[PDB]
Amino acid sequence: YLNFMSSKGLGITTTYTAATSQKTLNDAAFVIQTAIEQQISLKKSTEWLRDAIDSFVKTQANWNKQTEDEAFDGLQWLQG
């Protein structure tokens, strides 16, 4: 999440890993939260954020078809 939001101009672009300390990630989440509220004031809208979250969510394997075992044999050929 931190890396994705960073890439969209919201902070220093970061390579964070699961190995990064919890404290660091939480601090970084807050600097992103700050930046978020600023672009909410600037745009007076949250639709830009809706789209950012939607996109980010589908990035993650637990939240997309990668954890759905897409297959195409038999009638599964039609829709996966």
Next chain:
Amino acid sequence: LSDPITGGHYENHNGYFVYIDASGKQVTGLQNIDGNLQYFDDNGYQVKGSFRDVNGKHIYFDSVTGKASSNVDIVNGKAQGYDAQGNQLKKSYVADSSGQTYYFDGNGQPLIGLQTIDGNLQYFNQQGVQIKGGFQDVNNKRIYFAPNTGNAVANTEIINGKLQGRDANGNQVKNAFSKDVAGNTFYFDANGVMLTGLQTISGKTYYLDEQGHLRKNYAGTFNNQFMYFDADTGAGKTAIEYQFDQGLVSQSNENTPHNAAKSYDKSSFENVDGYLTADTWYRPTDILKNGDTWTASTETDMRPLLMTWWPDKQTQANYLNFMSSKGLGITTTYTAATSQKTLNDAAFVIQTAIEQQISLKKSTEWLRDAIDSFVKTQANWNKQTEDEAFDGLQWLQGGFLAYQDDSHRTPNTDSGNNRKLGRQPINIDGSKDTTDGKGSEFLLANDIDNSNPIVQAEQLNWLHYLMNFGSITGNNDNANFDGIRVDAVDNVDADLLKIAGDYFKALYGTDKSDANANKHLSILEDWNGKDPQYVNQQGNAQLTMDYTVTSQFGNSLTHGANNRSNMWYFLDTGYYLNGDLNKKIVDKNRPNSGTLVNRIANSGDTKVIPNYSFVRAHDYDAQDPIRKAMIDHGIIKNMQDTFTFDQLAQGMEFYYKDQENPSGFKKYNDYNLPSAYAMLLTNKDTVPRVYYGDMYLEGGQYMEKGTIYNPVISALLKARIKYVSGGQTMATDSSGKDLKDGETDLLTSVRFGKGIMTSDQTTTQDNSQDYKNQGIGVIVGNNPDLKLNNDKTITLHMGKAHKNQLYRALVLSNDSGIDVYDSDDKAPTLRTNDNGDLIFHKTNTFVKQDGTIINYEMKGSLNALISGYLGVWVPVGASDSQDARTVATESSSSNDGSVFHSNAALDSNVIYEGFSNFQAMPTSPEQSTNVVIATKANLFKELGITSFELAPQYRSSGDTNYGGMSFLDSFLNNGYAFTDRYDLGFNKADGNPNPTKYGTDQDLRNAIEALHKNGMQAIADWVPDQIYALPGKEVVTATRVDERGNQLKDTDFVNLLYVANTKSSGVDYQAKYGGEFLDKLREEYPSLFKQNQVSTGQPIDASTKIKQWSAKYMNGTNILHRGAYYVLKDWATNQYFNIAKTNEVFLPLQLQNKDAQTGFISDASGVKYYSISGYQAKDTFIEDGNGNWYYFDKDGYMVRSQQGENPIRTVETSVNTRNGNYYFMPNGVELRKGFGTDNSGNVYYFDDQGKMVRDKYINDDANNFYHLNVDGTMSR
């Protein structure tokens, strides 16, 4: 990346590699060390098999080497590729640590599922991994993906029990041919099932074997009627139609009488010994000047034979295409299949064009070059038909030809039934001719036939000329060589040793006394391990080398940074029974092994074989390293490569840098040279030899700069004079390969003094006192990381003749170098105990005799001068003029018949091999080797050199190269490669100076005299094996052979005519001095000329003198890259063209203005063939323009199979190499590289060239294996 560093060792701590700088500091971070990119964490340990982050880069390092390379990392949830520099890869394949392959797209994300890349179909699993070597159900189809590429291809699998076929798109195959991965083709019917046996499809017939494999290039009787299956598609032809496309046609026309030769002789034909060559030019009757008007030809007018005649249509077509390409006509694609008439017409339009460019340029040199070029294009006229090979001594120059005795075709070249090859010492009588014990007679250049008595006499003449060089060339009896080195002993007839030995006996009475023998020190380059025993049985006329000790230096000290044989191996304990050093019973029977001279307890009581020994030589541990260095730095590509002197100089700078590297690691150079010399120079029963290049740098100018080893070796040399004498012992702190807990494997070598032969001997038998201040102690290790246990003590048993005596160091190693002590006062002392032992501990406190206390650890060290330990100790109180040598006795000591004897007198000598093959050319006359030797003779006297081995002084053949590979001896002018054997630096005949690399002939005589003024002898390098770059051509009969003169197994180059360069100028010094001294010698010492030689049964023959070399006196030559058929031949009759004598002329009929008919013509009896030159083919193989081969029998008729009869025929031809069993089809075509069935159903196989194959396994491009019995049949 990161800037490179060198000069730091790698260290291992707790299972981890650390790297310590030249600075001496432990290294962290990313580092390029010697071209390898590596990383070390904060603690200084090296990372392997893990990813690290430096700057913007994600770099993996290898699991073995720790070197930066590509990998895939799972980063967060997802796979991402990375290169060697740590960049995320885009649109690239990467293989990970497990050898799995991903393809990452434009965004760097791996592709999944079916994909097409570079037009290749590939599949990827859901994790992004590439499927390779398997089937895969994707997109409602099954597809096989290839083992390594992973590309979609046809394949077969077995469904139920029936083979099924799958194509590239994953569809099953029905009604079609389809392959499998191995390469086999099958056919599958409408119901999908594979077909077997004979099948007709689409109006063509194919043969599928039991396995369903489509058989191509396969002959057999399938309809009980013959059928040949195509090499292209496997389609059956009846092989009834003749495939030759050339009917009998006449070639003569209106131009024939114009282009015919003016004359049938040497006037009108450029030739060698009467024969013609591809680049022969001839004189046509008339000339189409300017392409307009035929005009009679003047003598100067000459035209290339290839303008008008060709050996065959292939060559004709190639000539036309080549000349066309150079602006001479319509550029053409002609083949051998093109009609003869067309090619001939086209040759004439080219002839026209040629005469036009001759008028335009007013020259023919442009044409000379065009023909030369074209000729080398053709395989028959270049090395492709010479079977270039590089194994064995062939490594040097690419392979050898042996000349043959052939009075009918090549009589000037006949050797009179000489040319006995490989008569090396162990095979002097030919008794090992059929084994590897036959000598490698062929080494380099033109190998001289030293089995010929006439040649043997000439070699003696040359020998005499050298031994009297000064008397003969300067009337200076003090400028004569005293002794000889015999170059390449195992590559010549061993008679030469007897000839040389007997000569010395006759003229100097070397068999009379040790003083006579030793006044003419002489050595052998005799590498075979059985040569020492031979040389001794023959009375040691020249000193054998002792490779056994040179070899052990390689294994235990000189070679390799680490895993080295123990010093234990120097002892050769096997010498004694049961390896027992307490009991010391000599083992009278051993399995032909061990060192030549035992030195465990050498008291001089057992007779031993006299010898010289060395650590290095001009030709040992020099030529290879120096070139490896140039190769490693991109200065040349191959060892055989030609290099320039500047190229050598650049390489030499790296060589020197590596040699003197303070790290102590050496990549090209030898380790532990000081330690090796310390042993060499203290050993009893040997004449040691010292290599110039260990004392001075091997390149640049002579004696330009001393080496780092010079001080130490110089000290050892001067100490040898003062202290080295008496008996020897040698021991190691070691019992074998493997070391017990306390054991150091440190070698202790001791000499006792003049009359002292044993440890326990307390005094001389003659009561002389010389011994007390003589003797020496040497300690040496091969382990730079050697640390002693605190308790451990190491002892030098200096002997009971040296009780309670004070000893002082000559030489001591340490971590920065080796200290050298020039006199007693400047050195640490230490005193022997009551028993005469110097005891050493891990830690030592020595005292100087007057000055002070010194601390010293018995510690292995590592630096440019050593990798191990070295300590040498001498008795204090030695006189300044002390000399421990023994003078040689004038008395007849021995009735054994022998010349040299290993004893204290012989051991008092030292040879200096005073040159390097890689010296630069003298920049000025003043710096020429032999000038310098004269000014510096003094310096060598004081190192105890008694004989100076000078380089071979013969004039270098240089850059001259008549064909074939040049050798470094020649282009480096080192004197081993020479044109004139008697020119040792004489002036040009116009008066101008003409030095060798070493200086003029005067410089040589001055150098030799200077050495005699300083009591040293001068050694001549006697080089009888070969001679280089002879300017005259002759036609020999030659066979392609390996170093031992054995015909290569699969060669057609057998008894073929060849143009060789074998003839000397006849106006050279060899002409002046050749055989001149023999008459004088026969008069004065008759028995030399009456004594029989062993190999020949004959005495040497001075009745004929050699002023000019020629082929009849040679065994052969290195291949000259000219071709098997550069000497022109008619394919039809197999006779070679010739014009020497008008009674026996043979030319193509065109050139004699007769009608040449050429082609295939049928008659009632069978098919006949006429060559381009117009002769009928008989008893010869012939190739048509489409590439088919035929055999024409003695009667002149093509061989062909009849119905119901065996197609296999046994052929015995004029050309023997082609003898064998062939398979001819009904239309006469020979089967090649495929199987043929006989009339009875038996299958055989026939090779590349049509021959039947027997008694072996045979593999197939599709991995099918077949076996052929002895009778030829296939069991399979």
Next chain:
Amino acid sequence: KSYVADSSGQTYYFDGNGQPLIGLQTIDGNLQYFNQQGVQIKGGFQDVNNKRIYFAPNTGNAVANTEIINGKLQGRDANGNQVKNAFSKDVAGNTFYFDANGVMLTGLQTISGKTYYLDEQGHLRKNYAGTFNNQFMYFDADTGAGKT
């Protein structure tokens, strides 16, 4: 300056001159060998100079490999030198270790202060857990080095 594969799958490389390259050659930094007819050797050993070299099945690129000399497996590196005192691979992907005398090692081996487990076939085992020292030991997925 291009590779071409012919009808039979044989591969040649043509230089600037157009003449097919013959003998040992380096291309795109890859070491390759060509017979006297200009054909590329793939999937086999070869003797060039003084060093025997294996060339890969598809690329033909020089790589480490093992062959059986007499009855003992031996190891050959990418430069064609036999391997002594080191780890070396074979084409299949297995790593072996060869001692000072060139002979492949077997079983539990400690080298350079680390412990590796080689099975009966001499294969270095990575990501392998077991207790054969009468003590537990996990052999690294990276290098096969034993950790506790």
